[model samples]
Target: MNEEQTQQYSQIVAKCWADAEFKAKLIADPKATLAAESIAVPDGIELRVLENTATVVNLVLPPPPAEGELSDEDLGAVTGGLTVLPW
Candidate 1:
């Protein structure tokens, strides 16, 4: 993403994190809460909830993977094949 798009996304994410309702639901029903909000794109971005924590994580697709980037296989190995469910 370009600098402008990145900045826009950051602002939206900050707003979502600051929302009282969003935070309350994050604490209450994390699995059902919407983490990230995004606009139309080929590979859309999403906000997701983290496991065993109250943190909301962002999942951006089409990201350029670096060397030794983690994949599903790597994650499965790390978590004994357990997959992270999206909220």
Candidate 2:
């Protein structure tokens, strides 16, 4: 995301921390709440909100890069705890 998008995201999070109602609304319907807040999400992407508690934590993983996404050296195998580039 660019700087403007990140700024808007930060504002949303700040509002969530300060406003209970906003947080509830966001948690209930992230897409709608974000849209109402002027953040436009693409139709193809699905957005979901997850809140972390003292006892429970959520770890979100990004999709793995597709083939050719990274250079061969970056995806090279490791040897003795060091990367071995396929030269």
The TM-scores of all predictions, comma-separated, are 0.33, 0.55
Error of 2 at 20 (Å): 0.7
Q: Considering summed lDDT, which 10 consecutive residues are worst modelled in model 1?
A: 58-67
Q: Tell me the whole-model lDDT of each prediction, alpha carbons only.
A: 0.39, 0.49
Model 1 whole-model lDDT (C-alpha atoms): 0.39
- Cα lDDT for residue 50, model 2? 46
Clashes per model (N, Cα, C within 3 A) = 1, 0
User: Cα RMSDs of all predictions?
Assistant: 9.7, 11.0
Please identify model 1 stretches exceeding 4 Å from their true place. Answer: 20-38, 43-87
